[PDB]
Design a protein around this motif. Structure first.
Motif, PDB file in Angstrom:
ATOM      1  N   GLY A 122      66.387  63.208  44.374  1.00  0.00           N
ATOM      2  CA  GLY A 122      65.078  63.247  45.010  1.00  0.00           C
ATOM      3  C   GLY A 122      63.899  63.411  44.063  1.00  0.00           C
ATOM      4  N   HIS A 123      64.003  62.892  42.839  1.00  0.00           N
ATOM      5  CA  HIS A 123      62.858  62.946  41.939  1.00  0.00           C
ATOM      6  C   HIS A 123      61.901  61.788  42.209  1.00  0.00           C
ATOM      7  CE1 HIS A 123      60.440  64.056  38.494  1.00  0.00           C
ATOM      8  NE2 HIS A 123      60.333  62.758  38.271  1.00  0.00           N
ATOM      9  N   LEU A 124      60.793  62.084  42.881  1.00  0.00           N
ATOM     10  CA  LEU A 124      59.776  61.075  43.158  1.00  0.00           C
ATOM     11  C   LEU A 124      59.130  60.616  41.858  1.00  0.00           C
ATOM     12  CD1 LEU A 124      57.920  59.540  45.183  1.00  0.00           C
ATOM     13  CD2 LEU A 124      56.424  61.565  45.133  1.00  0.00           C
ATOM     14  N   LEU A 125      59.064  59.304  41.653  1.00  0.00           N
ATOM     15  CA  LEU A 125      58.461  58.772  40.434  1.00  0.00           C
ATOM     16  C   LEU A 125      56.987  58.443  40.620  1.00  0.00           C
ATOM     17  CD1 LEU A 125      61.475  56.616  39.279  1.00  0.00           C
ATOM     18  CD2 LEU A 125      60.517  58.551  38.017  1.00  0.00           C
ATOM     19  N   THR A 126      56.668  57.775  41.723  1.00  0.00           N
ATOM     20  CA  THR A 126      55.309  57.318  41.985  1.00  0.00           C
ATOM     21  C   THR A 126      55.210  56.846  43.424  1.00  0.00           C
ATOM     22  OG1 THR A 126      53.548  55.766  41.304  1.00  0.00           O
ATOM     23  CG2 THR A 126      55.811  54.948  41.232  1.00  0.00           C
ATOM     24  N   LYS A 127      53.993  56.852  43.961  1.00  0.00           N
ATOM     25  CA  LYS A 127      53.741  56.242  45.261  1.00  0.00           C
ATOM     26  C   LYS A 127      53.280  54.786  45.126  1.00  0.00           C
ATOM     27  CE  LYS A 127      53.138  60.542  47.793  1.00  0.00           C
ATOM     28  NZ  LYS A 127      52.243  61.476  48.530  1.00  0.00           N
ATOM     29  N   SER A 128      53.116  54.322  43.886  1.00  0.00           N
ATOM     30  CA  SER A 128      52.749  52.928  43.613  1.00  0.00           C
ATOM     31  C   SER A 128      53.832  51.947  44.059  1.00  0.00           C
ATOM     32  CB  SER A 128      52.475  52.730  42.119  1.00  0.00           C
ATOM     33  OG  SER A 128      52.351  51.350  41.800  1.00  0.00           O
ATOM     34  N   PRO A 129      53.427  50.803  44.648  1.00  0.00           N
ATOM     35  CA  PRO A 129      54.399  49.764  44.989  1.00  0.00           C
ATOM     36  C   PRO A 129      54.879  48.964  43.775  1.00  0.00           C
ATOM     37  CG  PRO A 129      52.208  48.983  45.474  1.00  0.00           C
ATOM     38  CD  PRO A 129      52.057  50.423  45.045  1.00  0.00           C
ATOM     39  N   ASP A 130      54.305  49.236  42.604  1.00  0.00           N
ATOM     40  CA  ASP A 130      54.657  48.522  41.379  1.00  0.00           C
ATOM     41  C   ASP A 130      55.865  49.170  40.699  1.00  0.00           C
ATOM     42  OD1 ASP A 130      54.766  47.086  38.976  1.00  0.00           O
ATOM     43  OD2 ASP A 130      52.675  47.434  38.439  1.00  0.00           O
ATOM     44  N   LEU A 131      56.989  48.461  40.691  1.00  0.00           N
ATOM     45  CA  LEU A 131      58.203  48.939  40.024  1.00  0.00           C
ATOM     46  C   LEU A 131      57.966  49.274  38.550  1.00  0.00           C
ATOM     47  CD1 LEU A 131      61.300  49.550  40.118  1.00  0.00           C
ATOM     48  CD2 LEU A 131      61.659  47.101  39.714  1.00  0.00           C
ATOM     49  N   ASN A 132      57.111  48.503  37.883  1.00  0.00           N
ATOM     50  CA  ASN A 132      56.793  48.783  36.488  1.00  0.00           C
ATOM     51  C   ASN A 132      56.108  50.133  36.311  1.00  0.00           C
ATOM     52  OD1 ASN A 132      57.953  46.455  35.311  1.00  0.00           O
ATOM     53  ND2 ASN A 132      56.109  45.250  35.731  1.00  0.00           N
ATOM     54  N   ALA A 133      55.265  50.511  37.270  1.00  0.00           N
ATOM     55  CA  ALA A 133      54.629  51.829  37.240  1.00  0.00           C
ATOM     56  C   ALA A 133      55.675  52.932  37.382  1.00  0.00           C
ATOM     57  CB  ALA A 133      53.570  51.943  38.323  1.00  0.00           C
ATOM     58  N   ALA A 134      56.656  52.709  38.256  1.00  0.00           N
ATOM     59  CA  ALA A 134      57.759  53.652  38.435  1.00  0.00           C
ATOM     60  C   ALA A 134      58.609  53.770  37.170  1.00  0.00           C
ATOM     61  CB  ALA A 134      58.614  53.236  39.615  1.00  0.00           C
ATOM     62  N   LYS A 135      58.885  52.637  36.524  1.00  0.00           N
ATOM     63  CA  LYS A 135      59.654  52.631  35.279  1.00  0.00           C
ATOM     64  C   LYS A 135      58.935  53.389  34.161  1.00  0.00           C
ATOM     65  CE  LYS A 135      62.517  48.568  36.056  1.00  0.00           C
ATOM     66  NZ  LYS A 135      62.833  47.188  35.598  1.00  0.00           N
ATOM     67  N   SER A 136      57.611  53.251  34.101  1.00  0.00           N
ATOM     68  CA  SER A 136      56.801  53.985  33.137  1.00  0.00           C
ATOM     69  C   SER A 136      56.905  55.492  33.382  1.00  0.00           C
ATOM     70  CB  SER A 136      55.345  53.521  33.209  1.00  0.00           C
ATOM     71  OG  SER A 136      54.570  54.128  32.198  1.00  0.00           O
ATOM     72  N   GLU A 137      56.751  55.896  34.641  1.00  0.00           N
ATOM     73  CA  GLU A 137      56.893  57.303  34.998  1.00  0.00           C
ATOM     74  C   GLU A 137      58.268  57.847  34.622  1.00  0.00           C
ATOM     75  OE1 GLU A 137      54.409  59.476  36.117  1.00  0.00           O
ATOM     76  OE2 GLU A 137      53.271  57.726  35.455  1.00  0.00           O
ATOM     77  N   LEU A 138      59.312  57.051  34.842  1.00  0.00           N
ATOM     78  CA  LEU A 138      60.663  57.473  34.491  1.00  0.00           C
ATOM     79  C   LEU A 138      60.816  57.709  32.986  1.00  0.00           C
ATOM     80  CD1 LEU A 138      63.582  58.108  35.222  1.00  0.00           C
ATOM     81  CD2 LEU A 138      64.078  55.657  35.109  1.00  0.00           C
ATOM     82  N   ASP A 139      60.350  56.750  32.196  1.00  0.00           N
ATOM     83  CA  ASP A 139      60.451  56.846  30.748  1.00  0.00           C
ATOM     84  C   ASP A 139      59.710  58.065  30.215  1.00  0.00           C
ATOM     85  OD1 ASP A 139      61.905  54.531  30.906  1.00  0.00           O
ATOM     86  OD2 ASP A 139      60.344  53.241  30.048  1.00  0.00           O
ATOM     87  N   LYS A 140      58.541  58.337  30.789  1.00  0.00           N
ATOM     88  CA  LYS A 140      57.746  59.520  30.458  1.00  0.00           C
ATOM     89  C   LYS A 140      58.494  60.815  30.818  1.00  0.00           C
ATOM     90  CE  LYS A 140      53.810  59.806  32.784  1.00  0.00           C
ATOM     91  NZ  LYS A 140      53.864  60.865  33.819  1.00  0.00           N
ATOM     92  N   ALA A 141      59.133  60.829  31.988  1.00  0.00           N
ATOM     93  CA  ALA A 141      59.858  62.009  32.460  1.00  0.00           C
ATOM     94  C   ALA A 141      61.084  62.335  31.611  1.00  0.00           C
ATOM     95  CB  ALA A 141      60.261  61.825  33.915  1.00  0.00           C
ATOM     96  N   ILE A 142      61.785  61.301  31.158  1.00  0.00           N
ATOM     97  CA  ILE A 142      63.032  61.474  30.417  1.00  0.00           C
ATOM     98  C   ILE A 142      62.805  61.534  28.904  1.00  0.00           C
ATOM     99  CG2 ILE A 142      65.352  60.498  29.976  1.00  0.00           C
ATOM    100  CD1 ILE A 142      64.991  61.567  32.841  1.00  0.00           C
ATOM    101  N   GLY A 143      61.733  60.896  28.442  1.00  0.00           N
ATOM    102  CA  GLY A 143      61.408  60.851  27.017  1.00  0.00           C
ATOM    103  C   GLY A 143      62.139  59.777  26.234  1.00  0.00           C
ATOM    104  N   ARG A 144      62.572  58.724  26.924  1.00  0.00           N
ATOM    105  CA  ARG A 144      63.167  57.552  26.277  1.00  0.00           C
ATOM    106  C   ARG A 144      62.958  56.339  27.173  1.00  0.00           C
ATOM    107  NH1 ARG A 144      68.073  55.758  28.397  1.00  0.00           N
ATOM    108  NH2 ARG A 144      68.876  57.157  30.031  1.00  0.00           N
TER     109      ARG A 144
END
Ligand SMILES: CC(=O)OCc1ccccc1
Length: 162
Positions: A30-52
């Protein structure tokens, strides 16, 4: 049963980006990444959260790390909220888990909407609180999960999670 086991049941575990009940990009437990409909925005948030650079995929260890952070932040948010803290502090340990669960799912923006539920919980009017809690978008949109959380608030037992 404890808050981690409870939320693990309610949120599931998925290692690839998926859409939550509201259609929002999410990963892990249940880790919310973003409310954006853009998958790329979600992928950016993920990379930032994990650090890779994850390209939308994480490991179980990484999912569990985000979950530890998210539970910690949910609890601490409750304590930093002037409306929530006194109610939380009035509760027993099991009902505290119900509170953390609800904040984890919904965040704090709708706290004022739950003013009456919160008062009833602080007054330990458990059946009344449970009735009031169900009169909500929350309950209507996720009724089986809300029923479990409400039973937890009503009884102060883990009966709904067995
Ligand atoms: C708004 C809400 O009900 O969040 C859950 C909760 C319940 C009791 C105490 C703190 C937080």
């Amino acid at each position: 049963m404890n808050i981690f086991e409870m939320l693990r049941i309610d949120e599931g575990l998925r290692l690839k980006i998926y859409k939550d009940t509201e259609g929002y990009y999410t990963i892990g437990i249940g880790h919310l990444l973003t409310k954006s409909p853009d998958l790329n925005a979600a992928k950016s948030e993920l990379d930032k959260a994990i650090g890779r650079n994850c390209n939308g995929v994480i490991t179980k260890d990484e999912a569990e790390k985000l979950f530890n952070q998210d539970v910690d932040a949910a609890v601490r948010g409750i304590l930093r909220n002037a409306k929530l803290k006194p109610v939380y502090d009035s509760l027993d340990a099991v009902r505290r888990c119900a509170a953390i669960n609800q904040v984890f799912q919904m965040g704090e923006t709708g706290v004022a909407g739950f003013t009456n539920s919160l008062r009833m919980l602080q007054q330990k009017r458990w059946d009344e609180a449970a009735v009031n809690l169900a009169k909500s978008r929350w309950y209507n949109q996720t009724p089986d999960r809300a029923k479990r959380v409400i039973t937890t608030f009503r009884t102060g037992t883990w009966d709904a999670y067995k």
